[PDB]
Amino acid sequence: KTLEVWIMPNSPQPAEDFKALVAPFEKAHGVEVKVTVLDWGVAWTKITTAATSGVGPDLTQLGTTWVGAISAMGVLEPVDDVLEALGGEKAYLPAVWRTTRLEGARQATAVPWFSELRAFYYRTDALKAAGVNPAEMFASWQGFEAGLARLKASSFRDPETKAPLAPLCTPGRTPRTLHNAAPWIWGAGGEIVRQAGGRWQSALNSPESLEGLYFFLSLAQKGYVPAESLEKNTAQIEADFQAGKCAVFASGPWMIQRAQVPEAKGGFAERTAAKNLGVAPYPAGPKGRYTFFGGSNLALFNFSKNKPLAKELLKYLGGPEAQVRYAQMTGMLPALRSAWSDPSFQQNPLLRTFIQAAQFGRTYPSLAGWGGVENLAVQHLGMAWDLVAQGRLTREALKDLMDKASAAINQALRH
Numbered sequence: 001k002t003l004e005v006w007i008m009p010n011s012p013q014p015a016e017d018f019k020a021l022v023a024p025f026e027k028a029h030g031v032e033v034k035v036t037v038l039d040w041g042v043a044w045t046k047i048t049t050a051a052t053s054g055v056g057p058d059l060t061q062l063g064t065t066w067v068g069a070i071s072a073m074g075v076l077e078p079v080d081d082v083l084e085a086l087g088g089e090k091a092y093l094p095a096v097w098r099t100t101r102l103e104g105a106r107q108a109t110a111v112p113w114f115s116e117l118r119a120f121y122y123r124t125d126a127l128k129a130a131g132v133n134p135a136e137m138f139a140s141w142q143g144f145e146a147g148l149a150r151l152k153a154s155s156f157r158d159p160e161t162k163a164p165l166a167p168l169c170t171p172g173r174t175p176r177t178l179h180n181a182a183p184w185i186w187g188a189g190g191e192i193v194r195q196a197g198g199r200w201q202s203a204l205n206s207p208e209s210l211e212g213l214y215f216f217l218s219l220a221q222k223g224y225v226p227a228e229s230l231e232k233n234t235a236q237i238e239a240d241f242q243a244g245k246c247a248v249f250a251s252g253p254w255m256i257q258r259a260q261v262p263e264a265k266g267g268f269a270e271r272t273a274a275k276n277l278g279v280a281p282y283p284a285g286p287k288g289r290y291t292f293f294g295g296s297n298l299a300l301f302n303f304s305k306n307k308p309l310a311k312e313l314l315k316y317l318g319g320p321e322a323q324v325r326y327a328q329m330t331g332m333l334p335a336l337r338s339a340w341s342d343p344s345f346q347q348n349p350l351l352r353t354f355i356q357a358a359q360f361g362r363t364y365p366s367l368a369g370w371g372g373v374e375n376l377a378v379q380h381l382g383m384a385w386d387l388v389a390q391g392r393l394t395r396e397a398l399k400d401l402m403d404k405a406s407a408a409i410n411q412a413l414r415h
């Protein structure tokens with residue numbers, strides 16, 4: 001007997017970790033679980049192709065932000081039974097509970113697998129050499145920019161590269177998602193979409209969203225982010241932080257685990273950045289402190305011929321044993337609230353900072369059109385970043401891009 005599962009690259013050796021995670025299940029049920037790893041860059045397309053075509057695995061990993069869109073296509077098995085067997089609504093953070101379905105849906109269509117939220121990794125050696133107290137830098141927008149100015153003026157040089165560090169690296173090339181931008185939007189008291197009456201509408205062109213976007217994008221126009229870094233994607237900026245080329249950058253808690261794994265095994269433990277590694281929350285904006293909170297769930301296709309066995313595997317993967325183990329393997333946080341209290345997560349000082357930052361975590365709504373909204377947003381924000389790279393992003397040009405972004409988004413949401 002056989003299950004097929006699709007997962008994204010959650011850990012250094014994604015197939016092998018997942019295989020080791022499900023071995024006791026394989027033993028106890030006399031079944032083989034076959035796993036296929038999809039790059040995040042391709043996963044949306046493969047998962048919607050499976051959904052329209054009726055050809056795919058029994059189970060797929062789904063990003064929390066995708067659950068609504070795939071559910072609304074009507075292709076997922078209800079999983080209220082699994083969620084009840086795992087302790088129902090009470091067993092989850094309300095933000096995690098809301099990702100188990102398309103907003104307004106009767107039935108749950110995804111089981112929470114792991115959670116993830118964003119914070120600033122920083123070079124403790126580079127901040128110390130620049131005279132930056134991280135508690136000041138990461139308290140506020142004003143502290144953040146004062147710190148980047150200090151990092152820019154620093155005479156510090158990385159002991160291996162023998163070169164200066166950029167103060168901040170953020171990608172300006174393939175903005176797949178708004179994850180990087182959202183906290184600046186939210187911090188200014190903006191939103192990506194707003195519900196008024198029944199209807200969702202873009203708020204990317206609200207004065208608040210525009211203040212936050214302009215603040216963020218203009219840091220690179222002020223020289224805190226080098227030219228180089230606006231022609232790079234997320235994976236390259238990650239590599240650049242690891243290679244000792246930036247003082248500060250925004251990512252999720254998986255980097256903590258990668259910092260403890262040798263180069264040889266797909267980590268960066270040998271690098272100066274790994275041995276001089278700090279974590280601070282996003283600074284509080286003028287209307288409050290937010291960070292992107294997400295993660296991945298697991299869903300069962302309703303065209304599967306292995307539904308009961310697939311539900312047994314969902315129970316196992318959402319359950320306390322596997323929740324703690326997979327979080328360890330991947331460096332993500334568990335989706336199951338109880339598993340947060342495992343000492344292995346409380347005792348890592350960097351992870352403790354991610355856990356405290358979860359208080360200000362903020363999710364996207366679980367909308368049916370969410371794929372097209374995010375896709376339309378990043379396409380126009382892309383063009384904003386191209387203005388930055390030529391030193392031509394004005395508040396007015398940004399308003400124009402976001403007005404158009406908003407027309408396009410409102411049009412898709414009317415569908």
Ligand SMILES: OC[C@@H]1O[C@@H](O[C@H]2[C@@H](O)[C@H](O)[C@@H](O[C@H]3[C@H](O)[C@@H](O)[C@@H](O)O[C@@H]3CO)O[C@@H]2CO)[C@H](O)[C@@H](O)[C@H]1O
Binds near residue numbers: 235
């Ligand atoms: O839009 C989907 C959204 O993504 C999830 O975030 C992912 C993903 O977008 C990101 O590219 C991914 O990439 C990491 C690997 O997980 C990590 O192992 C290492 O290879 O580095 C890459 C590149 O940075 O990491 C996150 C976490 O899974 C959101 O969590 C979720 O809400 C989804 O809707």
Ligand SMILES: [Cl-]
Binds near residue numbers: 013
């Ligand atoms: Cl692998």
Ligand SMILES: [Cl-]
Binds near residue numbers: 179234
């Ligand atoms: Cl991302």
Ligand SMILES: [Cl-]
Binds near residue numbers: 193363364365
């Ligand atoms: Cl929003």
Ligand code: NA
Binds near residue numbers: 174175177234
């Ligand atoms: Na991205």
